[PDB]
Amino acid sequence: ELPEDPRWELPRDRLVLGKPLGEGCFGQVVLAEAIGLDKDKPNRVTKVAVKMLKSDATEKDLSDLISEMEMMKMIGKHKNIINLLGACTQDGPLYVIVEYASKGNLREYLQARRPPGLEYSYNPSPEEQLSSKDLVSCAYQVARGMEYLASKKCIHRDLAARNVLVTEDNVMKIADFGLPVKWMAPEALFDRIYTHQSDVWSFGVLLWEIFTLGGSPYPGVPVEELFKLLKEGHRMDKPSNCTNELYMMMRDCWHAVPSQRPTFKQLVEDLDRIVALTSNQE
Numbered sequence: 121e122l123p124e125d126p127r128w129e130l131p132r133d134r135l136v137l138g139k140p141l142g143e144g145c146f147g148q149v150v151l152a153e154a155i156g157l158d159k160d161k162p163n164r165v166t167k168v169a170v171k172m173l174k175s176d177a178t179e180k181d182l183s184d185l186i187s188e189m190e191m192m193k194m195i196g197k198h199k200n201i202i203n204l205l206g207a208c209t210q211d212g213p214l215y216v217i218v219e220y221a222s223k224g225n226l227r228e229y230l231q232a233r234r235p236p237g238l239e240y241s242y243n244p245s246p247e248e249q250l251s252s253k254d255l256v257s258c259a260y261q262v263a264r265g266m267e268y269l270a271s272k273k274c275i276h277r278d279l280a281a282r283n284v285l286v287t288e289d290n291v292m293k294i295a296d297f298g299l300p301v302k303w304m305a306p307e308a309l310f311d312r313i314y315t316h317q318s319d320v321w322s323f324g325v326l327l328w329e330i331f332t333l334g335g336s337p338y339p340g341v342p343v344e345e346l347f348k349l350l351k352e353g354h355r356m357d358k359p360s361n362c363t364n365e366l367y368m369m370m371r372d373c374w375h376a377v378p379s380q381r382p383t384f385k386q387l388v389e390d391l392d393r394i395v396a397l398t399s400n401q402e
């Protein structure tokens with residue numbers, strides 16, 4: 121009994137469900153083909169992803185899934201977020217249709233492009249390596265995504281490389297912006313205060329994830345201790361490949377006083393200059 125929205129509705133018959141993209145996980149998300157998403161090209165098929173409830177679902181799981189859709193509707197369309205493409209609401213179980221990212225999440229994507237011969241950080245797949253310009257480009261893109269969300273007054277609350285998806289064209293797309301401790305600003309850990317500024321903290325941890333080609337942060341640090349260490353001014357060490365400039369950016373993102381962290385506007389501008397001066401040669 122969900123209200124019809126003709127801005128977004130797709131007839132179930134124009135949707136062909138393929139294989140699950142999930143690896144036995146949250147909700148369900150399957151690959152599909154959508155017939156005539158564009159009303160001006162109704163004979164073209166488009167590869168899409170489809171989120172639906174599992175068999176074992178509750179009336180809170182459905183309300184959560186509904187909220188998510190209604191929010192994506194309000195936030196609007198950007199290159200660097202996962203966009204809503206449509207929905208099947210009326211004729212059976214709720215389907216939410218979104219953009220397909222062929223290369224998976226950003227952690228996986230970076231891991232698979234690690235040098236094979238690193239004992240420190242092994243390659244668990246061996247895809248072509250990324251230049252340092254490619255890596256600064258990933259960070260620029262995710263920052264643009266977040267600049268947009270921020271401008272729509274959306275606070276992500278769990279920005280991380282897991283929650284960034286990568287397309288066939290290597291386009292970074294922020295996910296789950298409408299629904300872990302080691303990505304949370306201290307004021308989020310302590311006082312449960314979430315802001316654009318606490319998102320900027322998380323983006324710092326995400327820069328670290330990028331430049332470690334998908335490392336796990338604070339390696340060996342127990343969660344229980346984590347708060348105290350940070351209060352005492354503990355920060356992660358620079359990654360080995362990371363320039364001093366980009367480490368400064370991470371540290372700035374990790375300012376203890378929230379008001380002193382840079383904005384996503386500033387980070388975008390800064391990553392735009394950095395990308396342009398960074399070489400692809402290595």
Ligand SMILES: */C=C\C(=O)N1CC[C@H](n2nc(C#Cc3cc(OC)cc(OC)c3)c3c(N)ncnc32)C1
Pocket residue numbers: 141142143144145146147148149169171188189202216218219220221222224225285294295296297298
């Ligand atoms: C349980 C499945 C899972 O965790 N996957 C990770 C990799 C696979 N995968 N998930 C998605 C997605 C999605 C998505 C993103 C949203 O962004 C706001 C909102 C959604 O529902 C309302 C769903 C995905 C995509 N898009 N392409 C490729 N693989 C994907 C399964």
